């Protein structure tokens, strides 16, 4: 969508992730593992619900209106009675059709955004110790065990702790 994460730099989705809408898979010292991110999952879900409720808000009521079916042929007045209703229906139909198209388009960029926002947030947190591989995976240039992965995920990762190890592994090598 507008941000280019979903169906963009993040090649495809994980049918395996049954516990949330956005999340982390990882491969480290102690093996591999997956974990939904619940804050962006809730952020995407709340906006979609808010949107949904506003569309479902109050069917207004109408009681005695005009006749909309006729059994005799009458001419002028019945012609106007049919024309009023036919133009009311075409106007409300254009309205429903434009509404779900703007709505759906927005829902698709809104979730694209939440994805990219989680990506950028993780990026900012890893500071100088990781590099973007460009497919939505960061290469972390220091030993990062499962508690380390869990601190990135729960937003408490301290980059400073690993900066000297990371910078060394990342740059120096032989060039």
């Amino acid at each position: 969508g507008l941000f280019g994460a979903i169906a963009g730099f993040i090649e495809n989705g994980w049918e395996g992730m049954i516990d949330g809408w956005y999340g982390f898979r990882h491969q480290n010292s102690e093996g591999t593992g997956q974990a939904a991110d619940l804050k962006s999952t809730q952020a995407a879900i709340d906006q979609i619900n808010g949107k949904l409720n506003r569309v479902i808000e109050k069917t207004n009521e109408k009681f005695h209106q005009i006749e909309k079916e006729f059994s005799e042929v009458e001419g002028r007045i019945q012609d106007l009675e049919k024309y009023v209703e036919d133009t009311k229906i075409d106007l409300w139909s254009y309205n429903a059709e434009l509404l779900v198209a703007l709505e759906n388009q927005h829902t698709i960029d809104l979730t694209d955004s939440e994805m990219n926002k989680l990506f950028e947030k993780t990026r900012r947190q890893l500071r100088e110790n990781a590099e973007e591989m460009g497919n939505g995976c960061f290469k972390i240039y220091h030993k990062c065990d499962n508690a380390c992965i869990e601190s990135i995920r729960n937003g408490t990762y301290d980059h400073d702790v690993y900066r000297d190890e990371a910078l060394n592994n990342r740059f120096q090598i032989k060039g």
Binding site: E11, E15, G23, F24, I56, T59, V100, I108, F119, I149
Partner: protein
Amino acid sequence: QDLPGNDNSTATLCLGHHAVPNGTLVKTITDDQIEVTNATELVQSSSTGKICNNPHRILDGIDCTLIDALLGDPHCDVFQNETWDLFVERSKAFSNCYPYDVPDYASLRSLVASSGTLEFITEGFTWTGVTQNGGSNACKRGPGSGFFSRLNWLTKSGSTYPVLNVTMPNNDNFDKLYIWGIHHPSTNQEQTSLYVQASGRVTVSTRRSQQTIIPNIGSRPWVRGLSSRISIYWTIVKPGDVLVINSNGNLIAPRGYFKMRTGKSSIMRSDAPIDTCISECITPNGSIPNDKPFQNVNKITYGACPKYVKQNTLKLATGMRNVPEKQT
């Protein structure tokens, strides 16, 4: 820090989003089929087929149309003084009394249908010098001949039909609806037999209005053994005004007034069954739930209903785009 930080390994962290094997196609500004994770339908397209008799007061008309229930066709006497939020009118309804026609039938049906009550008050009209309570064999009431319960057919007394000139003041604080009519005889002979004058006349007026109708003599098609017709007219008399009825013959006089109210009442043609359940939205196809914003069941509705639309399906995506990881 610690000391010579030698253990130089790396980790990989990958961000991603879910995908589902199924997925639903929705329309967009730029695409008309894009697949998303999940969607919800906004067009109610199905009725239960039954008119729920709750919360509105539905009055099943059975084989009476509202106008016959109003005039008082014998077979509709059940409906006297009845009230409704919605009068359902059935396709099977029939008339079975003196042949009549109502010049602006549609306005009278409208006006009564939204008044919502057939509450009838009898007034003491005094017709001096004519014969009251005429009846006919086309309007059998029980064994006998009869006529509309609410109208009073006056014919000559002995050898004269005088000039009727009566008055009835509206002294209450509400409007009064008076239904009355005129008799169109088949032959000049029928005219003079019943009303003596060879040309009758009815003038009904208030301070604010007047209607004079003259009868029309001639043969119409045989209907229930008759070629004559009566035509129905109506007069609303506001508080403080006064009805003056003046006639020379052919009057079908009122017996009092219906009271008029202001409300949410209306009428609907439907052969759907009434049933016990609560539903707010009524369609001639039966009630429909009003949880969706739009509906495609029927453009005729009574109560809190979704807005009728031409489309039969409109799906609102309620999830991100589905980009599956294989599809199994």
